[PDB]
Symmetry: D2
Subunit: 504 residues, 4 copies
């Protein structure tokens, strides 16, 4: 009657859908990590504390804007808000910090707003003299090489793809275009060139410094913008270097080349972001769902984290409740298989950042119950390579056992996080309580569906079995406290050993 267990028992997907029940309450635990972009509306310590309480797991810093000093301060406030809960390690929630690079962006100059009208002429110039004199006649932008990569007849998008132009003529140092989709044009707006092979560096001089700064600031992960190919990833990896070797690189797929070359990018990366914002300008908007499902499926297949991003609850920037399309989008990203879901303007600058976060937590939890685990697990089994790795055997063994005895959690003791990632990849219904003494492991674990990281602060006990018992008992106290399970329930414990344990 709870957790859509009646639907879970259906023998066909169609019957599974038919049994979905709005009156069947979800379990307390929410498995899908929530990533929040931080900015004006959410940067204060006090607001940050509330965002943690509402469900924020990862703080995203968008380096397309802001100075190092501005971001260092954000990072400082995140940690302050986060450590304000550190006194009770049973209820302390780790919070990750993610650095999202600028990457090979193209931006217009400074206009004030001008109205671009359908059919009108607009000249694109590179002449720095017009750098701050952008108007409805002449538009400067910062991609000096633009004329060498675009052709006559090709389209240029400006401002989240809302304004569109067609290249009509190529001048010596300029482009002559005609407005197709008009609208009001502001300053320093994003420009996209679908069909063009932009030859900006995968990692610019600015990107290099931003990455280095990330290392200095001990960030947990990097969201690398406009990744086109494995070599782009390698450059990011080399820049993070030895000091940042444990920082996870999440490649953002935002253009056609990234999709085409997805497999090599995935192999090189620690995870993927479906960056629907740019992607849905670079390719036709009606095709984005295809790329999203393809990437989520392939990440699920490979056991690597995948993030669904951009415009998930967009209207909530201005309103306290989302649209029905938005409710559906979050649910479907989760049903698709997304490890995490993301908020951008909704939390960075919107008027209801707390409600946005809470709505993502609510929808995700409902959606997680509605997953058809019977089929998903069967298929993950079949598609999983038969190998000799014993930790891999234990992981699937534990997940199988968790479905059988309908356990309240799988408790995993992990140093690097790997052991727990191996369990997550099989997508158990039961929450995975990953107990670790490594603070970075705890933060980064949020990247994986189902992992609820807890940070053990007790010293290592001399006797191994006592040290194990200490950590498992910790996990038990967390589960009871958070209402995941209670005395007398049954949980699976992984330490290579799997034990099925009654909760005290």
């Amino acid at each position: 009657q709870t957790q859509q267990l009646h639907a879970a028992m259906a023998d066909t997907f169609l019957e599974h859908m038919c049994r979905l029940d709005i009156d069947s309450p979800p379990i307390t635990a929410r498995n899908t990590g929530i990533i929040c972009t931080i900015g004006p509306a959410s940067r204060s310590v006090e607001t940050l504390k509330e965002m943690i309480k509402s469900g924020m797991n990862v703080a995203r810093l968008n380096f397309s804007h802001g100075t190092h000093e501005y971001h260092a301060e954000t990072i400082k406030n995140v940690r302050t808000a986060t450590e304000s809960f550190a006194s009770d390690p049973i209820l302390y929630r780790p919070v990750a910090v993610a650095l999202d690079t600028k990457g090979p962006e193209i931006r217009t100059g400074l206009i004030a707003e001008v109205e671009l009208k359908k059919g009108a002429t607009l000249k694109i110039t590179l002449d720095n003299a017009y750098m701050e004199k952008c108007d409805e006649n002449i538009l400067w932008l910062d991609y000096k090489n633009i004329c060498k990569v675009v052709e006559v007849g090709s389209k240029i998008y400006v401002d989240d793809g809302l304004i569109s132009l067609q290249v009509k003529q190529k001048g010596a140092d300029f482009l002559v275009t005609e407005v197709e989709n008009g609208g009001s044009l502001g300053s320093k707006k994003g420009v996209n060139l679908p069909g063009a092979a932009v030859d900006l560096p995968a990692v610019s001089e600015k990107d290099i410094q931003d990455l280095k700064f990330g290392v200095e600031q001990d960030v947990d992960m990097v969201f690398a913008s406009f990744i086109r190919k494995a070599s782009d990833v390698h450059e990011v990896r080399k820049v993070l270097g030895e000091k940042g070797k444990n920082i996870k690189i999440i490649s953002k797929i935002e253009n056609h080349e990234g999709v085409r070359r997805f497999d090599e990018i995935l192999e090189a990366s620690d995870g993927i972001m479906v960056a629907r914002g740019d992607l849905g300008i670079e390719i036709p908007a009606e095709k984005v769902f295809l790329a999203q499902k393809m990437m989520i499926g392939r990440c699920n297949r490979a056991g690597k984290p995948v993030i669904c991003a951009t415009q998930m609850l967009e209207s909530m920037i201005k309103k306290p409740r989302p649209t029905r399309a938005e409710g559906s989008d979050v649910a479907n990203a989760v049903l698709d298989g997304a490890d995490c879901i993301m908020l951008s303007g909704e939390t960075a600058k919107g008027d209801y950042p707390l409600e946005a976060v809470r709505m993502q937590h609510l929808i995700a939890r409902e959606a997680e119950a509605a997953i058809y685990h019977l089929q998903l697990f069967e298929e993950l089994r079949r598609l999983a390579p038969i190998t000799s790795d014993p930790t891999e055997a234990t992981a699937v063994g534990a997940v199988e056992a968790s479905f059988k005895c309908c356990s309240g959690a799988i408790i995993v003791l992990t140093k690097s996080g790997r052991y727990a990632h191996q369990v997550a990849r099989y997508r158990p219904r039961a929450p995975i309580i990953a107990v670790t003494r490594n603070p970075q492991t705890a933060r980064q674990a949020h990247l994986y569906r189902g992992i609820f990281p807890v940070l053990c602060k007790d010293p290592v006990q001399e006797a191994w079995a006592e040290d194990v018992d200490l950590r498992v008992n910790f996990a038990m106290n967390v589960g009871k406290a958070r209402g995941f399970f209670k005395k007398g329930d049954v949980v699976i414990v992984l330490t290579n050993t799997m034990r099925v344990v009654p909760v005290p």
Copy 2:
């Protein structure tokens, strides 16, 4: 490398997802009906013609606003725009008219309010407790919801009765009945339409908790369902809506009855010429869920971009239709299925997957025969050739049915009249780019199935 045929051949749903390909172009035909709400932005004859050319199949009239004379005029304009293409029967596209009732609404006017009373106003955006907890700018005669409260208004009020009557007068093809809570609500509407309106399809709108709980009996009584997500998502927690949506679409598919996904599908396109990524995904997922039709409200009623909204639903539906995992869907429909006409339809659908036909052509008077084929959800479009104009319009309710209105005289020799109608379908399909000479299509003559080369 087209129609997601590589993903179509996957052995598992996961591998199906893994193979979805942005570079695999869809076919030209679009199976999912598009229902547009008409209003100031789309009322003119000139704009209506563009909306037909853009993909509109059903004109929805919201009787929550406007007078009979107003609606009569809209109806008149729809028919003028529609008939403007009649000169070429090969190119004429039927357009249906839907009457959507006010039903048990509450506007800023509920009598025993204080006898049943959280209170919501304006798409549940403004919230109230018996203090303004949420809020913002309040407007005129906005809609109110009392979640959890048993509002005792009549399922069919006096206004409703007169509106339904007006429906019969106006020869509308279908009624979308609001706030249907139970089988008995459906029976009241049916009685009003009475004998004169017995052929008018009744679509029950599920917009409250009781509608969901009593879904099965409501579906048994109705001709179809609308997942009325607007009110539904105020009446129950917004985060539960997708559960209701998928349950209803699932159960409608299982029953063989039309289901409409409605409300806020492309909402932002009221003010912008492009949708958000959430809206792109919503339309696509509604089609993947199994929705027969998708709907536009404000987007076509009142927005700045009516035509763009219609074109975008058209583009997305078409992409999503190819991304359906037909292998699993068809097998599950076959297994879950409980008559020679039924055997012939399932056989045609099976054939169509086998030879990857350009179409299944069905000759049908009442539409039943084409409905029976649509219920097995073929990939190939269903070109339904009928001489019955009402049949031609109502057929839009079913996924995959592309109705065509034959106006040729009835030939004396049966086989000749069949051949004339089939060749009419061939001509329509060639003209619309569905297939070309040499291609193969399946033909159901009305119990006969032919596998036939396009002449």
Copy 3:
């Protein structure tokens, strides 16, 4: 409550198994073709008539024995017996004639000069094998002549040699130029003209010998429907048989017999070149370890089903019935399991050729095949066949698969198919409907060859062609309805499916 329909509805194979019901009776129709080897026990017109009535569909002539004159007389008797029923076209059953070649056999000589004579071999004793034709008909306890002149260059000391269906085992202890001295590893009775296997050896005999060529030409002259080619090892072997049949025998079906390891290894190219396959378990289970035969069998049947080419399961299926009126439990199981595997036909050898209970054996295959055909898990089989079928531009394939799908939906009493060459009906059979396929043809050879395919019940229309097409179609369909009613496949009012050659119609029985 009939035809295992409760089991048919199960959602899993495991549950399909659990629902199999001994009290759920099968339909009348039996889909699996029964092939009977003719010999002393079954050569008379009287017995042949009864065998036909008991369910024989194909008469197999074993050219490993007998003269051309002998076989001509057999064929003559088969046709006399077959045509004795011709007077009522509605009840006439076409009966096919199959020529099974000798091929590259090794044969022993005559024991004490008699075809019927035996001697005992005792375990541990010694036995000399000779090629000296002086001992051709003087085989016995101590001297065994065989006809493979080059045997000494293919075998060695330690080499194992099997005689008579692998029952007698010998090991070579000493060579010679004209002989081998062997030790009997397993004794028993040693008859005359028995088959010899050298499972370790590389026999140098040709796939198609000059005797085989004569026999094949004779087959063409005699108008046989099909050839069962022995010891086929590769595609080129098939092509040689095909070439020998020539233009005149171009329509004769070639069935390749797989009886050695190489035939299994190169199975795919053999199948591609062949009209169909025989799982020749006799020789095969001597040439490879007996415990592996079931693997080869299931692999071959599976791949034949996948290819849509007929496959025959053969040899020792009801062996004990050569001497006894009822089969063993293993034999009942074997027949049932061959049909569950997907075998188009089953075969009887000694059971019908020389045994004391030929009619009972034919009857038992009939009874078992029918029970097992209902026990098939069509739900999964049809789903898999389809899933594994190429999307193609072929309209006849689309029609065939549509007919089969419909026949499951309405559980029809039959799929009626008008066919000239038989191909159209073959295309239906490849999708394995539960309902019998009544193939109406005017072509007598088509009618006979149709027995190769599971579920095809061929009927031969003798009526003159009608000038009006729709009238000619209606005549043939009504013929089919008449046969169906008379055989009890269905009755007036039942719904059946009709393919006319591309149209599918779903009509009621008149």
Copy 4:
């Protein structure tokens, strides 16, 4: 490449068939238990030793024949043969003893006389002709055969090869043949009023308890109450003896579910069954019963005529080879030999052939679908031991382990693992000699008997038994150092089930 692993990966059953490869060799371990009927041909200590070496796991004594004195000697000989291997516990193979009851048989008197197709015969109950049966008069021991018979009723003699049509009965030979003494007689479609447990069966069952037999195969079980009667005779002293119900008539098939519930296991007794019901229907009953036993997690034996021709020949027919393979493919826990080992000329060859075929067949199982289905059809519970067993089987598929090592006292824990039908052998280490013998009834369980004394230190005790298992596996070629195996530690004295699964490299 090996163990049909390529076919193992196929996405459909059909493609699974297409990939079966005569050149893909199986592993060493053979999971299907082999039950051998012991008689004149296999009764000596010398021959019994070879029987064990050839693959015999269970010795069946048919109490339809022979005196207690005869059977005690056979049992003594089995035990002498079996203990002759006990010096090296690592290579010792437990051997179970099964007592198969006479039950409600009907037989004829003493006399051979050739019977002729078309001839009258006198079925007489007159005990004067008890030892004077002949071509004209035939006496049988079923005294009330008249209340149950009727005109036109049929009667079968000698494995139903001779058939007859109907305080005495005059009949006609509907089917002839030579007639011996004391042959089995069947009355299909008639209700035989004999006791499920007769005076003799009772004494045989008590003798069985006294002789410490591991299991009883109870003949002609028609209903749940028959099973209870058998359980009652075995009583408190025989409470741990497994009752296998033999399903040999229509009633037993009909009332199968209640019989299965009351029983420790099932025998598909195809001999009598194929006389009681039409022979062409037997395979339906077999697959039904095997399927339902697999579903219930209870042992099922396929019996009778599996390698029949090997009574006289050193090699089986092709239908016999097929029958064995298919019984295994069906899911039979055990397969059986009767005349082939009791009296045939090639008992050792018959044992070996069952061993070879079962091993080839075990590899050819489509585990992918079988495991999926067993799971989906398996009631979820809170039972931690259930969770650990299924978890271990899943793990064993994932990492193609060499074995699943299970520590068990009464065998139950090992049975739970076996019900999920792993490909890997389940090495069941026990200190209980009976558990080690009875474990043979379960597909995939390879029982090893630990002779070591219990250690005080539990961890030391576990290591001891586990290492024993490692040594067994290595010595029998199941795995080698560096391989990976799954270990289930089971019951801890005074604490209870550990509910622990370890994944371990072979030392």
